[PDB]
């Protein structure tokens, strides 16, 4: 929540695999504007990915690590 | 131009002033899945903000620097 300075994080692009706790460390939830079907990550490789809008993966990391902050 | 991680930046937040090239540093363009009636850019201050689709101050900054990568 900030000014206007943001880009919508669109989940457009899927990862067929997915990715561990240890191969991850955000998750983040793109926003409104933007269909979202899915999550971004940031894993340790700086190589930002997606996820389906229900992984089994992504409710592990969502539900300890939503939003944190 | 990668694989499928990269968030569509959609430009749904304008920022009603604009910026000048000493306050800005890089500009994007979003991409095509989101209307982009704008672009991005990346101040100094880290601050990521948008633009209307023919500012006549982004012309300037895109029409040095749209793609130098």
Same mark, same amino acid.
């Given at each position: 929540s900030l000014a206007a300075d943001t880009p919508t994080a669109c989940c457009f692009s899927y990862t %067929?695999? *997915?990715?561990?706790?240890n191969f991850? $460390? $955000?998750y983040?939830?793109? %926003? %409104?504007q933007c269909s979202k079907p899915g999550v971004i990550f940031l894993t340790k490789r700086s190589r930002q990915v997606c996820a389906d809008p229900s992984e089994e993966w992504? *409710?592990?990391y969502v539900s300890d690590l939503e939003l944190s902050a």
């Amino acid at each position: 929540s900030l000014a206007a300075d943001t880009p919508t994080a669109c989940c457009f692009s899927y990862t %067929s695999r *997915q990715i561990p706790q240890n191969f991850i $460390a $955000a998750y983040f939830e793109t %926003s %409104s504007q933007c269909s979202k079907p899915g999550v971004i990550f940031l894993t340790k490789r700086s190589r930002q990915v997606c996820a389906d809008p229900s992984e089994e993966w992504v *409710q592990k990391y969502v539900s300890d690590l939503e939003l944190s902050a």
